Ligand SMILES: CC(C)=CCC/C(C)=C/CC/C=C/COP(=O)(O)OP(=O)(O)O
Ligand SMILES: [Mg+2]
Ligand SMILES: [Mg+2]
């Protein structure tokens with residue numbers, strides 16, 4: 287019944303999403319459409335909208351905030367897939383493959399441009415302070431991730447930092463900016479804000495877990511993609527610590543000497559060690575963030591909207607619950 | 608060197624010092640001299656220089672420098688947005704975000720034209736994209 291309440295809005299933002307991409311440029315219109323047509327769970331607008339519906343209020347700002355977040359989210363994906371060399375997206379070809387590198391970079395900046403155009407209406411420094419801050423942070427996270435490739439060890443703090451910027455904060459901004467465009471009170475804003483942050487953390491851990499556990503079918507790319515590109519994630523970290531407990535530090539030695547030119551045999555070894563030793567601690571950690579998000583949901587006033595958020599919390603974190 | 612130039616060069620040098628994958632190419636000398644004399648705040652001049660350099664870096668993106676250059680154009684875009692947000696320069700924001708949209712449009716259409724005069728004219732429009740609205 288939650289896809290019924292957001293039904294009129296999801297189709298509204300979708301309509302405006304296609305409006306925002308209209309361009310007198312031939313390729314860009316095609317390219318923008320290409321990724322905008324590609325799947326999309328629109329989970330960020332769903333947080334924006336629901337966060338604004340916590341208190342009794344109506345604004346045209348609310349639904350247009352959601353539109354902008356999606357545009358920024360998709361702007362990051364186009365650029366991402368070109369940087370990461372990915373050729374697939376939920377079963378759809380990536381823009382740099384379907385078109386070329388130049389189009390891929392242009393369309394990314396184009397989406398960011400229109401996303402910022404869309405919210406330029408909202409005359410509010412705090413709003414833009416928050417939004418521009420998270421965008422900067424996402425970049426910072428990407429810089430750190432790129433420098434952390436094939437560089438062991440990665441501290442637990444640095445890992446949390448990494449997954450915070452690349453997933454958690456944009457979702458936290460969704461709940462925060464949504465709460466602003468509805469003048470929600472500080473007590474209720476804090477809880478939904480921390481809900482968004484914790485749900486994003488938990489979700490990104492799950493994603494990192496799936497990189498090891500799942501098959502190429504639900505991934506769309508080889509199992510162990512993160513480590514094959516040098517990315518050290520908590521599942522690997524946890525697996526290493528467990529083996530050291532059993533006095534076995536061979537995995538540690540292998541990862542330390544890991545290089546961009548490493549043989550597939552070394553990756554296959556790493557993958558299986560992670561599957562055997564790193565999955566459960568990663569699930570445990572993910573659960574902590576999930577349970578923390580539940581607490582913040584339970585502390586906000588009982589209402590209809592609360593139930594929708596709770597049902598999204600069950601869906602997104604199903605792999606751990 | 609103006610005040611605004613010191614401001615952005617300080618912030619960029621801090622980024623290169625902190626994030627090794629941020630690469631800072633030189634600002635366009637012609638666009639600096641023009642921005643110097645623009646009748647706007649220190650913050651708007653920074654945003655202009657940031658977003659201008661961002662888009663110009665677009666042309667230098669290889670396969671050998673992409674995991675550096677792509678992200679670097681994105682902080683420069685994020686900086687641009689950061690410079691116009693506290694306080695919120697609404698008018699300058701609407702103008703320049705439009706410029707960002709249009710300059711990407713002109714660069715696409717540029718890829719599909721060989722005519723001589725049409726090339727010289729569109730390039731002119733692309734080079735001066737972010738400073739014309741202020742003249
Ligand atoms: C232009 C802009 C707004 C921001 C630029 C900064 C960029 C590109 C951020 C990328 C956002 C992160 C996506 C997840 O990365 P992953 O771990 O590679 O995710 P998957 O494996 O799904 O690709
Ligand atoms: Mg990436
Ligand atoms: Mg990627």
Ligand SMILES: [Mg+2]
Pocket residue numbers: 493494497512
């Ligand atoms: Mg991943």
